Amino acid sequence: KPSIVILGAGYGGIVAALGLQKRLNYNEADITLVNKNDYHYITTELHQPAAGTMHHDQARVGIKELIDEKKIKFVKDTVVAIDREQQKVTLQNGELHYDYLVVGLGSEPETFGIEGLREHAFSINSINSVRIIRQHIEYQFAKFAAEPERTDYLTIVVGGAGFTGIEFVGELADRMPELCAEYDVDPKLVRIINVEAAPTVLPGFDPALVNYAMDVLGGKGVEFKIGTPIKRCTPEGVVIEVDGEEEEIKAATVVWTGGVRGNSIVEKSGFETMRGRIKVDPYLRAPGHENIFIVGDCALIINEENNRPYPPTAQIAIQHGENVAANLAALIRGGSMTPFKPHIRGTVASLGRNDAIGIVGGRKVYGHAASWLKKLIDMRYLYLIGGLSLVLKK
Amino acid sequence: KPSIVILGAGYGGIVAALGLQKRLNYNEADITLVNKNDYHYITTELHQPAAGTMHHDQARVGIKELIDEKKIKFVKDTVVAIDREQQKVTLQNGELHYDYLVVGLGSEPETFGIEGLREHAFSINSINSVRIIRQHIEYQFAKFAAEPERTDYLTIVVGGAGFTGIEFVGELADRMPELCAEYDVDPKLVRIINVEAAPTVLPGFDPALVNYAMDVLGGKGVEFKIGTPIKRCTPEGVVIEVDGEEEEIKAATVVWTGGVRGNSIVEKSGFETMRGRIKVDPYLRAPGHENIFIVGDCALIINEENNRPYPPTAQIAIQHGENVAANLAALIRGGSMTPFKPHIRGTVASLGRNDAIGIVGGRKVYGHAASWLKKLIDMRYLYLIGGLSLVLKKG
Numbered sequence: 001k002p003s004i005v006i007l008g009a010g011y012g013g014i015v016a017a018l019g020l021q022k023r024l025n026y027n028e029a030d031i032t033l034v035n036k037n038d039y040h041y042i043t044t045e046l047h048q049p050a051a052g053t054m055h056h057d058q059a060r061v062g063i064k065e066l067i068d069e070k071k072i073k074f075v076k077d078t079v080v081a082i083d084r085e086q087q088k089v090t091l092q093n094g095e096l097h098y099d100y101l102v103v104g105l106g107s108e109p110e111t112f113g114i115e116g117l118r119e120h121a122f123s124i125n126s127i128n129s130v131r132i133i134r135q136h137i138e139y140q141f142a143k144f145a146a147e148p149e150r151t152d153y154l155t156i157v158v159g160g161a162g163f164t165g166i167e168f169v170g171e172l173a174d175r176m177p178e179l180c181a182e183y184d185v186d187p188k189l190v191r192i193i194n195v196e197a198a199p200t201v202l203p204g205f206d207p208a209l210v211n212y213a214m215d216v217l218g219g220k221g222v223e224f225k226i227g228t229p230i231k232r233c234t235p236e237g238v239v240i241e242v243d244g245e246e247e248e249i250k251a252a253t254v255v256w257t258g259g260v261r262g263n264s265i266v267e268k269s270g271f272e273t274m275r276g277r278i279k280v281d282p283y284l285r286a287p288g289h290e291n292i293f294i295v296g297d298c299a300l301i302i303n304e305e306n307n308r309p310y311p312p313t314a315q316i317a318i319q320h321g322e323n324v325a326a327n328l329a330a331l332i333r334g335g336s337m338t339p340f341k342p343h344i345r346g347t348v349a350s351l352g353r354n355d356a357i358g359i360v361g362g363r364k365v366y367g368h369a370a371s372w373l374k375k376l377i378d379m380r381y382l383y384l385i386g387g388l389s390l391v392l393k394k
Numbered sequence: 395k396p397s398i399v400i401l402g403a404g405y406g407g408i409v410a411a412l413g414l415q416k417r418l419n420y421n422e423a424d425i426t427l428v429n430k431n432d433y434h435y436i437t438t439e440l441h442q443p444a445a446g447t448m449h450h451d452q453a454r455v456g457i458k459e460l461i462d463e464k465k466i467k468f469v470k471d472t473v474v475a476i477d478r479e480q481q482k483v484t485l486q487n488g489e490l491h492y493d494y495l496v497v498g499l500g501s502e503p504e505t506f507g508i509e510g511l512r513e514h515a516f517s518i519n520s521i522n523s524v525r526i527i528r529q530h531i532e533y534q535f536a537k538f539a540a541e542p543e544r545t546d547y548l549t550i551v552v553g554g555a556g557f558t559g560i561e562f563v564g565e566l567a568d569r570m571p572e573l574c575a576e577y578d579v580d581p582k583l584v585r586i587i588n589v590e591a592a593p594t595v596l597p598g599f600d601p602a603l604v605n606y607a608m609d610v611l612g613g614k615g616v617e618f619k620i621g622t623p624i625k626r627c628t629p630e631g632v633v634i635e636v637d638g639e640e641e642e643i644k645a646a647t648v649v650w651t652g653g654v655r656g657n658s659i660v661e662k663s664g665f666e667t668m669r670g671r672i673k674v675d676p677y678l679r680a681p682g683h684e685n686i687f688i689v690g691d692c693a694l695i696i697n698e699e700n701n702r703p704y705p706p707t708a709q710i711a712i713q714h715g716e717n718v719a720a721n722l723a724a725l726i727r728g729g730s731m732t733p734f735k736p737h738i739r740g741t742v743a744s745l746g747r748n749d750a751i752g753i754v755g756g757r758k759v760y761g762h763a764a765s766w767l768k769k770l771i772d773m774r775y776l777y778l779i780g781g782l783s784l785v786l787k788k789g
């Protein structure tokens with residue numbers, strides 16, 4: 001049997017693996033799924049445990065529960081390198097050989113070379129990271145009562161006002177009343193600051209929704225600094241550029257939501273990449289390779305209508321996996337592949353537990369309605385990978 | 395007309411104020427109660443929130459709820475100094491004058507000049523401090539998953555194997571299963587180390603109780619280093635002395651339960667003190683002052699039967715408050731004072747939620763029996779200051 005190796009059990013990888021599971025037969029091919037952890041986490045929900053609004057266990061599921069060990073062989077390890085010439089993948093504790101390779105290693109934070117960002121700032125990109133962020137913040141608040149002068153303990157800087165930053169500060173704003181009560185903190189001293197280099201919050205998004213979001217978040221005490229880039233990050237806080245002059249913000253907590261890029265393993269393995277991502281062919285394969293497929297955030301897709309790239313999203317990542325699973329099954333059976341066409345049905349952004357903004361099917365949504373839509377959309381993914389049981393289990 | 399000032403709303407202070415409240419009548423004297431916070435915390439239970447086994451709100455109560463605003467005027471401020479000559483107390487936000495003074499400012503950590511102990515170690519002595527310790531520990535465990543090589547995140551060093559240290563590591567051991575599950579930690583990697591300079595755990599205690607305690611805690615993975623002093627403390631951990639040679643323990647968390655002293659304000663105000671505490675007269679008054687009284691941990695009392703000093707405890711602090719309240723009422727009303735006589739009943743040391751050791755009524759006690767015994771004894775104090783309602787509020 002031919003061997004299929006899928007790197008990364010994220011949205012793209014897990015859907016690809018489950019897709020191959022349904023389509024292929026009990027001995028048609030050998031499929032090995034490699035993941036850093038024995039669990040798959042719901043990346044789109046990670047902003048909530050980071051703020052502490054939702055327990056992290058509700059944002060992950062055991063991989064062994066999802067798949068069939070007969071059809072899929074799960075390997076828990078960390079990918080170190082990919083050798084295209086030898087068709088071998090190197091791991092920290094082993095090695096693997098592939099006839100076909102699917103790469104869904106996800107994103108990495110993009111710090112733009114900004115000094116201290118890697119060392120002194122946090123990222124919302126894993127279960128480990130969000131627990132670290134959450135416990136870090138509660139630690140600072142705990143320290144405050146003993147040291148009332150240090151309001152920097154109560155200051156949280158979120159760098160970048162994209163979708164991730166906006167959703168996170170929304171959760172943060174909701175958490176503050178309970179958090180302040182727990183540590184005897186005066187709520188008025190708490191500062192949640194969202195710092196954006198771009199002229200507007202949520203750049204390249206609909207102004208009606210953006211203005212609405214700022215109004216809602218501003219109501220909950222969130223501060224916005226726009227047209228303000230972060231020059232560098234320190235243990236004491238961040239340095240920002242205001243009116244051509246440097247200014248310092250003293251903050252015990254700095255969370256970086258400024259940008260993402262493709263996993264550096266891909267670029268290090270000698271692929272040609274733009275911002276760490278591979279601009280794949282219509283069949284989602286890496287250029288110059290017939291056996292290598294790229295999915296999720298590692299994959300780059302250009303829009304034919306406008307020369308702008310599709311953003312790296314879970315929505316398109318899921319669609320990558322379904323397409324790759326189908327094409328791989330056909331390819332193994334000597335069939336013909338079907339070209340990938342992305343179908344972006346629009347997106348919804350949460351603003352705390354009870355509010356949201358989105359454009360779905362060209363139609364705007366607000367408030368409780370938009371909030372339920374997002375919950376329904378996310379529930380649909382759970383059904384896709386885990387069935388009705390997974391939906392009920394959470 | 396006469397003004398009574400009580401400093402510190404701890405066991406000694408709160409009982410003294412409530413005692414004066416019950417005994418005295420309206421307008422007999424002016425009573426002012428000064429505290430750092432608007433709440434009074436049950437210091438004897440603080441080890442539980444520090445470990446996270448019990449919520450900190452269950453270990454404190456609002457002062458205004460306990461007292462009578464008509465009889466007692468509560469002031470939330472921090473005492474800075476006492477001027478004996480002018481009979482004035484200096485605060486951060488004011489000044490006060492007293493005809494009579496009651497000092498119950500409690501203990502402060504005693505680090506004995508050991509390097510880095512004051513700066514880099516934690517103390518279990520307030521609601522603020524235990525919340526800090528608790529969140530610190532959970533933070534280290536959170537960091538571990540990202541960095542599995544750093545087992546020092548999972549190492550907690552508790553300095554001193556006295557009553558406080560033993561109770562704390564007991565709570566810590568109970569907490570570990572829940573804590574490990576929350577942060578995907580392998581329980582076998584967790585190290586709880588209790589370091590004592592003295593040759594045995596719980597120095598000056600009955601060996602039968604000590605052996606039982608070590609057996610229970612040792613079973614739960616608690617490590618004991620005896621005859622081992624702490625040379626110095628760093629953010630990375632501690633340096634200890636083993637067989638006359640320096641040795642290092644890498645620990646993200648260091649908690650010091652090695653010793654206490656009288657609140658430094660007393661010493662700073664020019665009183666004569668031994669280890670920061672005042673050796674009071676039979677009426678709990680400071681020597682050379684007829685109007686200044688000392689209660690709780692600030693006071694030092696020697697037992698007449700055996701010339702050893704009484705340990706600083708909540709039990710004797712409560713008795714200090716009752717005695718001072720009675721004597722102050724008598725002095726103002728022209729009555730006769732009663733010399734303080736301590737009646738020290740037994741005490742129980744918890745070993746987690748479900749285990750304990752104690753000598754109660756001259757009889758040794760263990761397990762579930764001792765645990766229920768301790769809970770009732772502490773409940774008695776809740777009744778003393780808060781009545782049946784406060785006892786009910788702990789449900």
Ligand SMILES: Cc1cc2nc3c(=O)[nH]c(=O)nc-3n(C[C@H](O)[C@H](O)[C@H](O)COP(=O)(O)OP(=O)(O)OC[C@H]3O[C@@H](n4cnc5c(N)ncnc54)[C@H](O)[C@@H]3O)c2cc1C
Nearest residue numbers: 008010011012036043044078079106296297312313314315
């Ligand atoms: C707070 C937040 C909210 C978001 N909300 C939305 C939303 O609402 N709608 C939407 O469309 N998109 C949303 N996104 C974006 C979406 O989550 C990403 O586009 C999606 O995660 C990308 O899919 P992926 O599988 O390629 O990446 P990932 O989900 O990150 O998958 C990576 C997987 O591979 C593992 N892995 C990574 N590196 C290695 C390695 N060297 N070795 C072994 N295993 C490895 C990882 O452990 C992980 O399991 C959100 C992102 C964030 C941070």
Ligand SMILES: Cc1cc2nc3c(=O)[nH]c(=O)nc-3n(C[C@H](O)[C@H](O)[C@H](O)COP(=O)(O)OP(=O)(O)OC[C@H]3O[C@@H](n4cnc5c(N)ncnc54)[C@H](O)[C@@H]3O)c2cc1C
Nearest residue numbers: 402404405406430437438473500690691706707708709711
């Ligand atoms: C974990 C732990 C467990 C214990 N278990 C027991 C036990 O089981 N049995 C027993 O008998 N004893 C026990 N003790 C000892 C007991 O708690 C103390 O002896 C008792 O608290 C002493 O009474 P106190 O009022 O003098 O001190 P405290 O209780 O500390 O009272 C001090 C009060 O004054 C306030 N204060 C302090 N400084 C200032 C300032 N400058 N300005 C304004 N306010 C100030 C404080 O905020 C506090 O309210 C335990 C101690 C600890 C740490």
Ligand SMILES: NC(=O)c1ccc[n+]([C@@H]2O[C@H](COP(=O)([O-])OP(=O)(O)OC[C@H]3O[C@@H](n4cnc5c(N)ncnc54)[C@H](O)[C@@H]3O)[C@@H](O)[C@H]2O)c1
Nearest residue numbers: 160161162163164195196197229230258259311312347348
């Ligand atoms: N609801 C959703 O559909 C959803 C939710 C989260 C993420 N996403 C997708 O995931 C991808 C990643 O999201 P993201 O928010 O992390 O990145 P992003 O690129 O979408 O936005 C990050 C923002 O950071 C700002 N920034 C960059 N450098 C800065 C600096 N030095 N100082 C201050 N601000 C700076 C940029 O202007 C940018 O707007 C996006 O393409 C996004 O579309 C989608």
